[PDB]
Amino acid sequence: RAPLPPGDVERGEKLFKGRAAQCHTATKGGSNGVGPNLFGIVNRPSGKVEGFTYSKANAESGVIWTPEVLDVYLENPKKFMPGTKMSFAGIKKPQERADVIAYLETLK
Template sequence: MGKDSFAPGDSKKGANLFKTRCAQCHNLKEGEGNKIGPNLHGLFGRKTGEVEGFAYSDANKQKGITWENDTLFEYLENPKKYIPGTKMAFGGLKKAKDRNDLITFLAEETK
């Protein structure tokens, strides 16, 4: 498993990470609406700052990247470093394995 790039992980472990580290601020399913953070349904292939009805920071709107495995892998390590000015208060997942597990789960659950 690559340490500096995405590699498929364990979605069950990713589900637990989502529950304990992400679910308080994000929903996953279509139609569930936004919480403190935007709903993540349809995340893959979407550009930063595009969830309808969510008040993004200018930094998120202007970043202009498309969310996919590699961009999420880098972002989730340190969100405030990847998008300076983001409103996301999450400090990040430092372990590559944790990021891989979470991204694998998100890829399955946000379609």
């Protein structure tokens, strides 16, 4: 597996608005919806967003969302975590994936 290329936060923001925002808010204290609020998610344990009802798979995943883990997971969520109720096919293109992860890193 080759490394992701370098990301861009602005390209990543646009991709977040277009793809993650269908189910995810990004602001601190932003609301839960289809999916949990994602503020502060990078390098944090999975399944901890207050008020969100996770599947047992995500609730007990135990994974820590490092950029490297987000790389593999966001490429194909269901393959990485069978049982996830995150119904997203993934970000297949490495550059787009890198950009989204760079943006997530800015979510303080």
